[PDB]
Curated annotation (Swiss-Prot), chain A:
Name of the gene encoding the protein in the UniProt record: rpmC
InterPro entries documented for this protein: Ribosomal_protein_uL29, Ribosomal_uL29, Ribosomal_uL29_CS, Ribosomal_uL29_sf
Phylogenetic classification of the source organism: Bacteria, Thermotogati, Deinococcota, Deinococci, Thermales
Family membership: Belongs to the universal ribosomal protein uL29 family.
NCBIfam families, sorted: L29
Protein name (database record): Large ribosomal subunit protein uL29
Keywords of this entry: Ribonucleoprotein, Ribosomal protein
Entry's Gene Ontology cellular component terms: cytosolic large ribosomal subunit
UniProtKB/Swiss-Prot annotation, chain B:
InterPro entries membership: Nucleotide-bd_a/b_plait_sf (IPR012677), Ribosomal_uL23-like (IPR013025), Ribosomal_uL23/eL15/eS24_sf (IPR012678)
Keywords: Ribonucleoprotein, Ribosomal protein, RNA-binding, rRNA-binding
Matching HAMAP family: Ribosomal_uL23_B
One annotated GO biological process: translation
Superkingdom of the source species: Bacteria
Molecular function per GO: rRNA binding; structural constituent of ribosome
UniProt keyword Magnesium present: no
UniProt protein name: Large ribosomal subunit protein uL23
GO cellular component term of the entry, any: ribosome
Pfam family, one: Ribosomal_L23
Similarity annotation: Belongs to the universal ribosomal protein uL23 family.
Organism from which the protein derives: Thermus thermophilus (strain ATCC BAA-163 / DSM 7039 / HB27)
Subunit composition and interactions: Part of the 50S ribosomal subunit. Contacts protein L29, and trigger factor when it is bound to the ribosome.
From Swiss-Prot, chain C:
Signal peptide: none
Biological-process GO terms, alphabetical: translation
Name of this protein: Large ribosomal subunit protein bL28
Keywords per UniProt: Ribonucleoprotein, Ribosomal protein
Family: Belongs to the bacterial ribosomal protein bL28 family.
Subunit description: Part of the 50S ribosomal subunit.
Gene: rpmB
From Swiss-Prot, chain D:
Organism this protein belongs to: Thermus thermophilus (strain ATCC BAA-163 / DSM 7039 / HB27)
Name of protein: Large ribosomal subunit protein uL24
Any one cellular-component term (Gene Ontology): ribosome
Entry keyword annotation includes tRNA processing: no
Assembly information from the UniProt record: Part of the 50S ribosomal subunit.
Length: 70, 95, 97, 107
RNA sequence: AGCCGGUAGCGGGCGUGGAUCCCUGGAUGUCCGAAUGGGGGAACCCGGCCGGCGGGAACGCCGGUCACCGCGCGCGCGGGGGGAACCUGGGGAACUGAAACAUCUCAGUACCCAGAGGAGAGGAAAGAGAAAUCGACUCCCUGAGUAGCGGCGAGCGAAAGGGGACCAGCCUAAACCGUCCGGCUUGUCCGGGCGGGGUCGUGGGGCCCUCGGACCGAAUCCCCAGCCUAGCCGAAGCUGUUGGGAAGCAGCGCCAGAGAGGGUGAAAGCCCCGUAGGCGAAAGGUGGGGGGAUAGGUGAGGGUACCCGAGUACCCCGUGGUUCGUGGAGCCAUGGGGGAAUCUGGGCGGACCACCGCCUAAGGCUAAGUACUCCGGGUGACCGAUAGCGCACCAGUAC
RNA sequence: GAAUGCCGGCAUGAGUAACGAUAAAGAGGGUGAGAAUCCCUCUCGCCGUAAGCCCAAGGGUUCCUACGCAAUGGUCGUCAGCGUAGGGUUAGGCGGGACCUAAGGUGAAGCCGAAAGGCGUAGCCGAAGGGCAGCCGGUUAAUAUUCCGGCCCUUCCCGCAG
RNA sequence: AAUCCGCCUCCCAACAAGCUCUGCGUGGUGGGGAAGCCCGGGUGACAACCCCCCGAAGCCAGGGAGCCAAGAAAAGCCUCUAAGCACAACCUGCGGGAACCCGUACCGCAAACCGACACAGGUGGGCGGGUGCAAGAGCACUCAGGCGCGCGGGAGAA
């Protein structure tokens, strides 16, 4: 993911509520599994995407954590 | 957080796993610590099906070496889920 | 053969020194040590049972500090001890040391 | 914390020593780990390649070899001379490389 | 200004809209391990309660909580295990030496156990010991291989004093006053908390008369300088020639608070990294120095004889410690027996007595000077792959 | 230059002993650069209270297939329990656990011991003992009381009826 | 505590039954199915699936008799009642739902375990066919299955 796209994700994410953050992760964790399946059948040439989602999910969860801490 | 997409990892791609599609038996690699009951709910919410029967087995990693360095592959666990009569998990029918 | 609950008296290590010959002070040639070996000297531990607040308290105490037990019972009078377990009472008494 | 490279991709440099002493060229690539830089058209060697899909007909190709970073001195875009680099503080106050013979910037 | 570790490749991305990378803080942190819900053949198994998920009552999963012990009015705080040496304490050998051996030695060593920390111990005289004297303790030099101890054998081996390092002194118990509580043998009663009070050896304190009525100041807390955990600036060289290569040689220069050193195709002050000299922290750690609070600290005569740490001092028996091996054997310590006193009290100055002096036991705390090196750095008339750590290399590995 | 020194290297004995049960071999065809040794056929011999088959220990991928022969195989090797890669182990009923106890182990209570620790009725743990519900066939290169087919059964939750 | 158990008395029953549990047989139904021939499979084949005899150390079983050396425990299970509660609860029948974790490959008298070795050694339980020999797990041959032992070819001295 591009640097600017990362700033933007954090901005938008920090605006969501915890419930929305949970839901958004559950979607990305799903989109990840799809990437894993296309990885196994040899149909994912843009393999960097697998890393991206994993770190997006991390960032999202990190922020979700921020919210719950007060 | 824990989701069904954390329990189902990859589909088992092999002659033996394919032969099960015909009678509606789908074979996935699952997280090694995952339960039959837990796998049931996981496959269902992922592929919108109805699981009737779950079989699991552990798959010890093969010992493998690279020159001087003897090692081992990660231990895996695979599950063979049974979908309700006439249902289909289409992602796997693929093939 | 153990440790005094009151005085803290513990078993100590002493030597047993065997000697022969006549003392110099008695015109002797002098005393010769024909053997030294380690031994233990135990406190004179004894059992002291006392009724305090309707409960039976027992102390394992050196004979030297036997009357120190009764002193503690006297000083226990200004305490609200009734209702407590015997294990509890003993703790109160010993705290007053 | 990081290797000190007084030169970068891709300012114009003079190769001051070795076989190609005198030559001038742009810095194609910088390799901080080997502490070496690739200078365009300098250090040409003949590498043999297997006849492959990539190289049908086979034979040899030509490759620019890395030069030790010290063998290279940047050419000042102001006075046009080979120089040492200096650090200068601006009002930003960012720091920039400036030529040592005159005062010109080197980016 | 490059980057996606060693690690290239296939296949794909990121970066002056500041990436990789470096320091600081934070978040995540499966299972075992003190391991602590319960069990267990560690990394596995099995539960209780509250909440959530699934169609969910059975079943399963996610979050939270549930061991035991100590101290304090079920709930709080604390404990548990680990650390290379270093340190105190509780126990404690033998080979060996005595050219045999038992006392003795080795040696309170090796080792085991408990414990403490960044140090531990000790520490504010019931001291020293002869100076009409010194003045807590610790550590070094010296006193001194002296004094002495010793099958007076082998051997063991102080202290006072002097020179230095560091520097610091405190809080209590008791008498008396007050307050809360409970005890039954009802009160000027006994007792337990808490507060006041008091802390000394020219003895000090209490109580009762008498006169007198701002200075010190922390070892605690607060701020700060300084330091540590990333870094940054940093002078002066070109040309010819041999050569694969110049830093060699030659010509003409230049810097220097920098001619330590390592690189660069060979031998470079001026190419590179550095060096002299400077600069640098938002964050965390430190902070013994600077500043400020706080706690705490402070008179003099006279009377009273109330108080000054108990199974203690003291004596005897058994022992340990000291240079002291039963010796004229004191001192310090204490397992057994006996067993006081409160300043006209008591301990000590090497049996004992007198005299003359010293000191204040039976409660506690206390920096620094000192030890060590797992860790980081600097430096070697230190090693250079049979060396140097067991390991320069995927070693506490293969075997 | 010697320490039956230490570490390593390389010699000698020497093309020598040996090549691990005297149950035993022979031919033809195939493969391949190479074949007494691998594959196939026929003939011959050996085991058969095993030298056959099924469990449990223990071992831990050696199982199956593809491609290989440097080393391992006491020879050879195209072969292999060897090298590389891919595949393969499916259970409410089988075994163990969510059941029970045995010796023993541990251990609230309690007892003892310089320290570490030693005991100890209950309880807990501890099995190849007690208890407990699946039999026949089919299928894979490789798993099956596990998948499939037929016919049976157990517990738990809930509901109805008596 | 107790209607249970134990003990005493009485009545009926008793080598009967009844009741209950297991074994074996049959059993709706499903399976298998040879030689030989032909390239593990196809065929044989609508395969046949029957009578007699031998017969266990195994089953009914917790059976019987004898003997002395006198031969585990606890749970599941049935019964009793106490707190409790009797709208509960439990039993019986039926129905639907629910049913977790680990092992499972392969060698296993051995070239895969213990013996440094693909080592003439060691390793517990079960199956272990046929004929003949008095019997047998002995012995000889042989079935199923498995092998000919991972150097060979010659020669015919001591
Ligand atoms: Mg980032
Ligand atoms: Mg998580
Ligand atoms: Mg297949
Ligand atoms: Mg689940
Ligand atoms: Mg469902
Ligand atoms: Mg499993
Ligand atoms: Mg399973
Ligand atoms: Mg790994
Ligand atoms: Mg004696
Ligand atoms: Mg004498
Ligand atoms: Mg005399
Ligand atoms: Mg003597
Ligand atoms: Mg006694
Ligand atoms: Mg008594
Ligand atoms: Mg005494
Ligand atoms: Mg006495
Ligand atoms: Mg040059
Ligand atoms: Mg030139
Ligand atoms: Mg990599
Ligand atoms: Mg590429
Ligand atoms: Mg690339
Ligand atoms: Mg920045
Ligand atoms: Mg960090
Ligand atoms: Mg997990
Ligand atoms: Mg635990
Ligand atoms: Mg839990
Ligand atoms: Mg436990
Ligand atoms: Mg719940
Ligand atoms: Mg639920
Ligand atoms: Mg949970
Ligand atoms: Mg401890
Ligand atoms: Mg500790
Ligand atoms: Mg000691
Ligand atoms: Mg102790
Ligand atoms: Mg001993
Ligand atoms: Mg000796
Ligand atoms: Mg010696
Ligand atoms: Mg010696
Ligand atoms: Mg000597
Ligand atoms: Mg000797
Ligand atoms: Mg001698
Ligand atoms: Mg001797
Ligand atoms: Mg000694
Ligand atoms: Mg010690
Ligand atoms: Mg400790
Ligand atoms: Mg200290
Ligand atoms: Mg220090
Ligand atoms: Mg004092
Ligand atoms: Mg002298
Ligand atoms: Mg002498
Ligand atoms: Mg000594
Ligand atoms: Mg001194
Ligand atoms: Mg001095
Ligand atoms: Mg100093
Ligand atoms: Mg002083
Ligand atoms: Mg009262
Ligand atoms: Mg009182
Ligand atoms: Mg009072
Ligand atoms: Mg009072
Ligand atoms: Mg006075
Ligand atoms: Mg203080
Ligand atoms: Mg610089
Ligand atoms: Mg410079
Ligand atoms: Mg030239
Ligand atoms: Mg030159
Ligand atoms: Mg010159
Ligand atoms: Mg210098
Ligand atoms: Mg130099
Ligand atoms: Mg140099
Ligand atoms: Mg020179
Ligand atoms: Mg030189
Ligand atoms: Mg140089
Ligand atoms: Mg400096
Ligand atoms: Mg500097
Ligand atoms: Mg006064
Ligand atoms: Mg008095
Ligand atoms: Mg005193
Ligand atoms: Mg006292
Ligand atoms: Mg005395
Ligand atoms: Mg004495
Ligand atoms: Mg002594
Ligand atoms: Mg003595
Ligand atoms: Mg003497
Ligand atoms: Mg003495
Ligand atoms: Mg004494
Ligand atoms: Mg005594
Ligand atoms: Mg006096
Ligand atoms: Mg006196
Ligand atoms: Mg004394
Ligand atoms: Mg005296
Ligand atoms: Mg004295
Ligand atoms: Mg006197
Ligand atoms: Mg004195
Ligand atoms: Mg200080
Ligand atoms: Mg100190
Ligand atoms: Mg030091
Ligand atoms: Mg160092
Ligand atoms: Mg050298
Ligand atoms: Mg050197
Ligand atoms: Mg070497
Ligand atoms: Mg070495
Ligand atoms: Mg060498
Ligand atoms: Mg090292
Ligand atoms: Mg080595
Ligand atoms: Mg010589
Ligand atoms: Mg030899
Ligand atoms: Mg020899
Ligand atoms: Mg010889
Ligand atoms: Mg040698
Ligand atoms: Mg030699
Ligand atoms: Mg040798
Ligand atoms: Mg010979
Ligand atoms: Mg011969
Ligand atoms: Mg031969
Ligand atoms: Mg042989
Ligand atoms: Mg042979
Ligand atoms: Mg024979
Ligand atoms: Mg042939
Ligand atoms: Mg042939
Ligand atoms: Mg062959
Ligand atoms: Mg061949
Ligand atoms: Mg037979
Ligand atoms: Mg096994
Ligand atoms: Mg093995
Ligand atoms: Mg292998
Ligand atoms: Mg297999
Ligand atoms: Mg294999
Ligand atoms: Mg093959
Ligand atoms: Mg080979
Ligand atoms: Mg070969
Ligand atoms: Mg070969
Ligand atoms: Mg070989
Ligand atoms: Mg070979
Ligand atoms: Mg061999
Ligand atoms: Mg094989
Ligand atoms: Mg293989
Ligand atoms: Mg395959
Ligand atoms: Mg089944
Ligand atoms: Mg359960
Ligand atoms: Mg259990
Ligand atoms: Mg049990
Ligand atoms: Mg025990
Ligand atoms: Mg206890
Ligand atoms: Mg027991
Ligand atoms: Mg239990
Ligand atoms: Mg059990
Ligand atoms: Mg069992
Ligand atoms: Mg059993
Ligand atoms: Mg079972
Ligand atoms: Mg079971
Ligand atoms: Mg059945
Ligand atoms: Mg098989
Ligand atoms: Mg079935
Ligand atoms: Mg009903
Ligand atoms: Mg009764
Ligand atoms: Mg009745
Ligand atoms: Mg009755
Ligand atoms: Mg039947
Ligand atoms: Mg039948
Ligand atoms: Mg029947
Ligand atoms: Mg049929
Ligand atoms: Mg057939
Ligand atoms: Mg046939
Ligand atoms: Mg047919
Ligand atoms: Mg026909
Ligand atoms: Mg017919
Ligand atoms: Mg029999
Ligand atoms: Mg019987
Ligand atoms: Mg029992
Ligand atoms: Mg029980
Ligand atoms: Mg009632
Ligand atoms: Mg479970
Ligand atoms: Mg299996
Ligand atoms: Mg099997
Ligand atoms: Mg087998
Ligand atoms: Mg055998
Ligand atoms: Mg057997
Ligand atoms: Mg076999
Ligand atoms: Mg085999
Ligand atoms: Mg052997
Ligand atoms: Mg073997
Ligand atoms: Mg061995
Ligand atoms: Mg082997
Ligand atoms: Mg063999
Ligand atoms: Mg064998
Ligand atoms: Mg046998
Ligand atoms: Mg027979
Ligand atoms: Mg005949
Ligand atoms: Mg017969
Ligand atoms: Mg015969
Ligand atoms: Mg016969
Ligand atoms: Mg025989
Ligand atoms: Mg036989
Ligand atoms: Mg025979
Ligand atoms: Mg045959
Ligand atoms: Mg053979
Ligand atoms: Mg052989
Ligand atoms: Mg052969
Ligand atoms: Zn310039």
């Amino acid at each position: 993911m591009k640097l600017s796209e990362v700033r933007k994700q954090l901005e938008e994410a920090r605006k969501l509520s915890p419930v929305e953050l949970e839901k958004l992760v559950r979607e990305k964790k799903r989109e990840l599994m799809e990437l894993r399946f296309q990885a196994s059948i040899g149909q994912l040439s843009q393999n960097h995407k697998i890393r991206d989602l994993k770190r997006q999910i991390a960032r999202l969860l990190t922020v979700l954590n921020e919210k719950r801490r007060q | 957080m824990k989701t069904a997409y954390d329990v189902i990892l990859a589909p088992v791609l092999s002659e033996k796993a394919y032969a099960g599609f015909a009678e509606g038996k789908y074979t996935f690699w699952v997280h090694p610590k995952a339960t039959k009951t837990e796998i049931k709910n996981a496959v269902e919410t992922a592929f919108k099906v109805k699981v009737v029967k779950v079989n699991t087995l552990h798959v010890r990693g093969k010992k493998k070496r690279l020159g001087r360095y003897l090692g081992k592959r990660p231990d895996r666990k695979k599950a063979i889920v049974q979908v309700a009569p006439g249902q289909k998990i289409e992602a796997l029918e693929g093939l | 053969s153990k440790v005094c609950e009151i005085s803290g008296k513990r078993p100590i290590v002493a030597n047993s020194i065997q000697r022969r010959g006549k003392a110099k002070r008695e015109g002797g040639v002098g005393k010769k040590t024909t053997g030294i070996s380690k031994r233990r000297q135990y406190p004179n531990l004894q059992k002291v049972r006392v009724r305090v607040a309707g409960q039976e308290i027992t102390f394992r105490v050196a004979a030297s500090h036997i009357p120190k037990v009764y002193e503690l019972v006297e000083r226990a009078k200004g305490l609200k001890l009734e209702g407590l377990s015997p294990k509890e009472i003993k703790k109160e008494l010993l705290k007053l040391l | 914390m990081r290797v000190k490279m007084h030169v970068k991709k891709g300012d114009t440099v003079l190769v001051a020593s070795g076989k190609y002493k005198g030559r001038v060229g742009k810095v194609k690539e910088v390799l901080p780990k080997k502490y070496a830089v690739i200078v365009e058209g300098v250090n040409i060697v003949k590498k043999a390649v297997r006849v492959s899909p990539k190289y049908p007909q086979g034979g040899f190709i030509e490759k620019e070899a890395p030069l030790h970073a010290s063998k290279v001195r940047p050419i000042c875009p102001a006075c046009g001379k080979p120089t040492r680099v200096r650090k200068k503080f601006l009002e930003n106050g960012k720091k920039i490389r400036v030529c040592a013979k005159c005062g010109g910037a080197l980016d």
